[PDB]
Design a protein around this ligand. Sequence first.
Ligand SMILES: [Ca+2]
Ligand SMILES: [Ca+2]
Lengths: 219, 219, 219, 219
Amino acid sequence: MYLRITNIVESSFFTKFIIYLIVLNGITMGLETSKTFMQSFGVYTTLFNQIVITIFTIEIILRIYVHRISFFKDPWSLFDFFVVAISLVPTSSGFEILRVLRVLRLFRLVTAVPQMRKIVSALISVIPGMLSVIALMTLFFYIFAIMATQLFGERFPEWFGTLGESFYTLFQVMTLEDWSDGIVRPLMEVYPYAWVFFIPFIFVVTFVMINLVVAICVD
Amino acid sequence: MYLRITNIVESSFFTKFIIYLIVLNGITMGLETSKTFMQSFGVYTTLFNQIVITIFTIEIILRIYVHRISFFKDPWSLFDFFVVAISLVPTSSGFEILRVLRVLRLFRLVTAVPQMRKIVSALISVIPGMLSVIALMTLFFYIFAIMATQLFGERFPEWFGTLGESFYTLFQVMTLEDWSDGIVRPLMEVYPYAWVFFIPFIFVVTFVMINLVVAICVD
Amino acid sequence: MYLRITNIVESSFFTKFIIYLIVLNGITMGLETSKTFMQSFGVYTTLFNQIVITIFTIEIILRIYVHRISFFKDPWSLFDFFVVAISLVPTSSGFEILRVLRVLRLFRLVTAVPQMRKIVSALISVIPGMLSVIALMTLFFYIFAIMATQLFGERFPEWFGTLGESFYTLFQVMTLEDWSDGIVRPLMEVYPYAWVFFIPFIFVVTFVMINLVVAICVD
Amino acid sequence: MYLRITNIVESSFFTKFIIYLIVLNGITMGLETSKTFMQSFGVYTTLFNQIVITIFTIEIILRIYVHRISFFKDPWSLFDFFVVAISLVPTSSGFEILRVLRVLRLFRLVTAVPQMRKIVSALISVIPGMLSVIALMTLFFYIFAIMATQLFGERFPEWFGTLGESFYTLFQVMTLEDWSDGIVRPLMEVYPYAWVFFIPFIFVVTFVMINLVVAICVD
Ligand SMILES: [Ca+2]
Ligand SMILES: [Ca+2]
């Protein structure tokens, strides 16, 4: 019976049937946004959802027989397994993010279509050649985040009171959003020289990011 | 008579005449901005406008005989067709953007001057090699927009109350404008962990956009 | 006497002397900023300043005898002429920006030092390959500035009331600065669909700009 | 005994022992952020710190015998030297940034690890090819800052009242942060034409900055 199911699974019909449910469930999930819609057709769509969730567990089960160990060493399959498993955890208990994380399944449209898969893989492949820069940065961030907390967190605890807060703030200085009027001009009312900490920080981090982009435009 | 008019249409004089009218009518449309000007020469210009509109329908009619089906397979001609058609709908009824859409005819300067066509065509040609990325993103936006509507739209309906609202907001976070002080620092006064949603969103979206630019700098 | 002066003008000592005054007069102009300094040594400075202006007119006079027509066909010499002429208009009357425009003579350090000249020239040379795009953009801006003036300038005259105002506003949207919370969200309180005008504008303008950067990386 | 120590110094154990202490001391400095932690285990960590500081001076001393003059011509060692010297200045007196500058020793992880050095060196090497541009900009900034101080610093002394103030403000305009709603729309309520100063400044400075990135993408 193995080859029987193995010919169903591997079939064009199967794959295209799954893709058909994804685009359907995805449309159905945008509709579950509308409180209007739900007051009318919410029963339809909760059951339709549980239906699709079964079909997807059935499918993921079949795919496991047909591939065995080959399956749990496939990134894309691992993804599908995990994303479906989230949708299995009862509509209750723990947190409610698990109810919301259900929408992550629409990423199956990426997993189950090679043109998407191509593009995604193309992107992700660029990551390993950045890890040296990324690591450099995280150290830099870590250092300055600590310095900031002990330079400004007493008078300015909203922003620098805690290591985490300094991280968040320093990230935001890095996107350059409201960094001057929102943060450094205020800081400078109390610490005239705070500009000596932030202008350099801005240069370094912006420099590094120019390099990282140009790095990727070599490979 | 076909070849008679075909020699008129194809003539350098004909084209340079049309181009001459565009620049004038374009100049005349920036004058129609001034309430001062309109109170003194408003009629001078409205008739000058109706004049140019006929001349352009006459031309488009002529250009059609000379080209027949070849015409409605030319992007640039199709454009001029649709744009002049807009200017034909009576100055009234329906919506009044149609009165405003009239200034789209100054894009005829692009269509009728070859150096412009080059650059426009240069630009547009870059789009197809972006479609797989652009599609990737749209799915991504779609998924996150839904996640935000159901995570922040009850307490924060201005910004996330509706699927489209979340779309607009997520775009603004992507342009990085007032994303922290405007949206996320606020959100975190109620949802301490909103940063776990928006930092990843900013990374992914910024990365993808760096790749797309680098992609273009390969092709 | 010609060759006598021609050997003085073309001398290393001459050039280095001029470069000396520039770096000196430039330091002088930053000190002229301090309200303190001026009460104390302001007179010292104004005479030293007029002295320098003489020397510079003498030089430019000499430089012309030694080059004649060749001089008024040199970009860099023309600049030096045009800048020194400005510093010649009495510190009185007309517009007083002329008193301010004087500091433009510190650009002579770019003109008199070759390494600078190289870099400037390197930059300027990139301009001609952008002119088709820069023209394209201006037309785009012109057309949209007009659409905006007649679409929002009645309720929003601060931002769109005039062709120029719309220009300025549209530029600011292009730098993406406070474009959503500062302008478009406001607009949308009255014109729910103003988003259909600004998102496309932002896409088009940012696309074009990515291309121009990549266009340069090609050339 | 020279070769005896030279074998200890050059030992993989020695170098890995140092890297081991850096990662601990770094972990320990993030815990020193928490006021809670300090009330409990603060005395633990002050000693642990002074311990490591001794060890690091011992190492730096040992490393000097083994390398002599070669050591004070090595960037990375010089650094290591200077960063520990800061950490030696008593926990008192002068300024107390010296207490804060102690966190710069975590940059020793960049020094002590070759994978990092590589990446850092890759970056720094790009600097020399930028100095002609950087010099140009600084001149440009200097000139404009002076032009701004004497154009807007009387009415707008918060932002342009001083040479330094103008510098900071001009920098902020250059990052394009809050530049229109925050600076130039205000300025223009009093100086209608202030736009004539800042739009060109934005163009020039953003142009140059595009080139600089592109320059690094050809080197
Ligand atoms: Ca902003
Ligand atoms: Ca604000």
